[PDB]
Design a protein around this nucleic acid. Structure first.
Ligand code: MG
Lengths: 70, 29, 172
RNA sequence: GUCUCGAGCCCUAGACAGCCGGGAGGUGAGCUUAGAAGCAGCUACCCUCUAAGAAAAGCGUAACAGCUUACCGGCCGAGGU
């Protein structure tokens, strides 16, 4: 039902393509309040019990794309 | 006596109060 | 060394000299187990394979005698089953059991029938496209099963194109 | 091939091997690209669940699928390397 993680990051960023070299070349940006909205959406997709660990799975795709958190 | 086996027994004894060999060892305690 | 083998209830085994006879409901198997300083005896209801020597050569045979006796126990009870499937590409092969020998006719277009003799008490049953070799003596059954596959040997032409022949499907 | 002597390491908290079971999700990573989803190539190689389970070691596919490897559990039981 709920679309993939790679698509949900590109909507609230404004950028389409990633990078030639991840983590070494920073492209997009996010904030803490913006990751708390993506954590509410995926409930049957993630295996995490709490909302605390549900955010870590989204961050575990972000830093390996070129997204810096402020 | 491996260090990870000692840490595992202390993790099982923690979830009794609150491998089948490591469970038996933890129950005997 | 000494290895004691407990005899099953369905089985009863007698022994004289170097020969061991193992009887059961599926039949009887007599084998000769002869090697230097290895004594195989029947102690009531256990088979004892012992030797005063512990060298690699003696140890190899003690372990071989063990598996030979354990296999005889299985043979006289549940028996030994080898399943085979007859495959052909162009020429319709005619496999038939004619007496104490299994005959394969019209193999690869041959006018002359290919045949092999069945080893002892081994029974070969055929049900259309399938063949099932069975009996108490694994030595006899294993060989008769092998003999059938070896019978369609082709050394002259490519095996990958000319694949016709009965092949072993099930190993026990 | 076989005999003999030494050293290190692992083992009844169960070793070596075999067999059974599990080999999971985020996500078919991103870039490349019509596509590439462990496995053409470039870069990274991160965290959840958990007793394990690689951003995949080897095959396999046009690409999937499919088969096992790592890794965990079970059966077994004495030495093993
Ligand atoms: Mg030629």
């Amino acid at each position: 039902g709920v679309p993939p993680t790679a698509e949900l990051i590109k909507d609230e960023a404004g950028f389409e393509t990633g990078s030639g070299e991840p983590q070494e070349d920073f492209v997009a940006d996010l904030s803490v309040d913006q990751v708390k909205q993506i954590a509410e959406q995926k409930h049957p997709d993630l295996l995490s019990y709490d909302l605390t660990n549900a955010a870590k799975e989204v961050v575990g795709t972000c830093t390996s794309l070129g997204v810096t958190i402020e | 006596i491996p260090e990870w086996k000692q840490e595992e027994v202390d993790a099982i004894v923690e979830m009794i109060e609150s491998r089948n060999t490591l469970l038996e060892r933890a129950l005997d305690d | 060394p000494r290895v004691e083998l407990e005899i099953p209830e369905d089985v009863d085994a007698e022994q004289d000299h170097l020969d061991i006879t193992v009887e059961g409901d599926n039949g009887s198997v007599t084998r000769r187990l002869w090697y230097p300083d290895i004594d195989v005896s029947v102690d009531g209801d256990t088979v004892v394979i012992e030797s005063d020597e512990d060298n690699a050569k003696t140890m190899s045979t003690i372990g071989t005698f063990q598996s030979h006796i354990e296999n005889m126990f299985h043979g006289v009870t549940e028996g030994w089953e080898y399943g085979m499937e007859v495959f052909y590409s162009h020429f319709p092969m005619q496999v038939n059991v004619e007496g104490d020998e299994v005959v394969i006719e019209n193999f690869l277009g041959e006018k002359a029938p290919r045949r092999t003799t069945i080893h002892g008490d081994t029974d070969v049953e055929i049900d259309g496209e399938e063949l099932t070799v069975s009996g108490p003596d694994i030595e006899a059954v294993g060989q008769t099963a092998a003999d059938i596959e070896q019978l369609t040997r082709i050394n002259d032409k490519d095996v990958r194109v000319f694949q016709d022949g009965v092949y072993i499907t099930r190993k026990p």
